[PDB]
């Protein structure tokens, strides 16, 4: 897959498609309607692809 580190800056908002959701049962989870992925981490930052 990939090696290295990620999620360095956690003070930035999420890119297009991504949308954080707050639930008392699920908690805080980011749902990407574009990539169709769900992760609590914040891919925000200088990262192209």
Swiss-Prot record:
Q: Which residues form the WW domain?
A: 12-43
Q: In which tissues is it expressed?
A: Widely expressed with the exception of skeletal muscle. Isoform 1, isoform 2 and isoform 6 are highly expressed in colon, kidney, lung, liver, and pancreas. Isoform 5 is predominantly expressed in brain and heart. Isoform 3 and isoform 4 are highly expressed in pancreas and brain.
Top-rank taxon, per record: Eukaryota
Which compartments is it annotated to reside in? Answer: Cell junction, Tight junction; Cell membrane
Q: Which residues carry this modification: Phosphoserine?
A: 10
The record's note on quaternary structure and interaction partners says:
Part of a complex composed of AMOTL2, MAGI1 and CDH5, within the complex AMOTL2 acts as a scaffold protein for the interaction of MAGI1 with CDH5. The complex is required for coupling actin fibers to cell junctions in endothelial cells. Interacts through its WW 2 domain with SYNPO and through its PDZ 5 domain with ACTN4. Interacts with cytoplasmic domain of ADGRB1. Interacts via its WW domains with DRPLA. Interacts with ESAM, LRP2 and CXADR. May interact with CTNNB1. Interacts through its PDZ 1 domain with NET1. Interacts with ASIC3 and AMOT. Interacts with FCHSD2.
- What's the stated role of this polypeptide? Plays a role in coupling actin fibers to cell junctions in endothelial cells, via its interaction with AMOTL2 and CDH5. May regulate acid-induced ASIC3 currents by modulating its expression at the cell surface.
Q: Could you identify this protein by its name?
A: Membrane-associated guanylate kinase, WW and PDZ domain-containing protein 1
Q: Which organism is it from?
A: Homo sapiens
């Amino acid at each position: 897959g990939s090696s290295g580190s990620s999620g360095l800056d956690s003070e930035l908002e999420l890119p297009a498609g991504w949308e954080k959701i707050e639930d008392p049962v699920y908690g805080i989870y980011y749902v990407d309607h574009i990539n169709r992925k769900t992760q609590y981490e914040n891919p925000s930052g200088p990262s192209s692809g």
